[PDB]
């Protein structure tokens, strides 16, 4: 699983592609994000984008990112326990 | 597969379904709730008046004297299933054939009730299975 160091590179690959109002909260998000797979960060930008559809915004605010991180995390952890490697 | 055709993704045809089990304990919560098993009906041990009517439904073919007080031997029979009552009448007719008598008497019915409940209270299916209920 990405380390605390890498996890930061992965975020910056999926927020560049998408529109934004300029996002400086990846310093906070990475620290909140534990056990996130590559796959969950990419989904995190999407959930942030789906709060942007409800507000009728057309940019991902840094507030919408704080909400999305928490939302992916709550359901992930609960419902699936990912494997322990050898 | 069975669960999925009793709610379909479509209305299914005119199909009534009857389930008969010796334990509801076993059954899954998906089978039990209404829309797939609407009405639960319990067939339980008959009370005293039940055991009087079920003696009348086995005995009416039998030749018995007029002085049989079926209330007397239903009162003497403890809490019993309808499957013990068949064996009661069979054994009443049995002691009459051993005795060389064509008609079953009051003495013979008491012996039979004694024999069925005494021995087979050791082998009663009723006690274990009533607890799973």
């Amino acid at each position: 699983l990405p380390n605390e160091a890498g996890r930061l590179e992965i975020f910056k690959i999926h927020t560049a592609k998408v529109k934004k109002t300029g996002e400086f909260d990846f310093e906070a998000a990475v620290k909140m994000s534990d056990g996130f797979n590559g796959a969950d960060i990419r989904n995190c930008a999407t959930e942030a984008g789906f709060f942007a559809i409800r507000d009728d915004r057309d940019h991902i605010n840094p507030d919408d990112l704080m909400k999305a991180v928490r939302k992916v995390a709550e359901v992930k952890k609960l419902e699936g326990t990912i494997e322990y490697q050898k | 597969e069975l669960i999925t055709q009793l709610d379909g993704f479509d209305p299914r045809g005119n199909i009534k379904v009857m389930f008969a089990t010796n334990r509801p304990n076993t059954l899954d919560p998906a089978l039990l709730r209404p829309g797939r098993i609407d009405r639960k009906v319990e067939f339980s041990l008959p009370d005293l008046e039940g055991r009087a009517n079920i003696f009348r439904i086995h005995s009416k073919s039998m030749s018995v004297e007029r002085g049989i007080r079926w209330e007397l031997i239903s009162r003497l029979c403890p809490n019993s299933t309808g499957a013990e009552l068949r064996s009661v009448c069979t054994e009443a007719g049995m002691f009459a054939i051993r005795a060389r008598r064509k008609v079953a008497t009051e003495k013979d019915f008491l012996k039979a009730v004694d024999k069925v409940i005494s021995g087979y209270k050791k082998f009663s299916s009723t006690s274990r299975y009533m607890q799973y209920n």
Binding site: - | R75, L76, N79
Partner: protein, 242 residues
Amino acid sequence: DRGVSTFSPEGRLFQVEYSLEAIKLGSTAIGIATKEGVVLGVEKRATSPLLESDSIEKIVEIDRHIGCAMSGLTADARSMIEHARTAAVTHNLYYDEDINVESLTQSVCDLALRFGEGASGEERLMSRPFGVALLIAGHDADDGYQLFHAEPSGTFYRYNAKAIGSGSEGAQAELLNEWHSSLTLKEAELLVLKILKQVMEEKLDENNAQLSCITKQDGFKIYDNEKTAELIKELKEKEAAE
């Protein structure tokens, strides 16, 4: 495996509910309460001819003004009757007056629930409740003659006449038709002996049936076998008068 405290999905303690069926297996107790006294009738139900039928006991004195009848597994009632004499006696020691019937009955009902698995120092003195039900009869000056049915349910009702035991269903059908407030003490005796014969599984005679009354004047008295023989001869007469 279930504990002993567990509720069913209906909200009933398993053991306490099951216990009621142990009473159905017991022998017949009949109780008719009048304004002159209460009559207690029992089917002794000897099990052999060798069994001496006089040593069997199902009626017992609690105090000179309270008597008791038992139905069910009757060795449990050895423990209930011992508590009762103490409450009744200890209560005459502290307050110089005989208990009420209604108060004595309630003390034996409190005792009844005491089953459990133990927690801290607290006594739990059974594993399952008393497998016996009682018809407590008695008389105080305050409310005349009374008759109570105390069940292991932990609830007691005051009755005008109740019958428990093997022949409970068919016995209480006859009472509902025959009882009214204007029975005397000598009509109730023949009325118990008539109902005792309809639900009895033997021949009615003086050896295997017992009568008992409770009057203010004479206290609680168990009839000897001689007196009961006269009342048995007096039943056959009123049925041949017709």
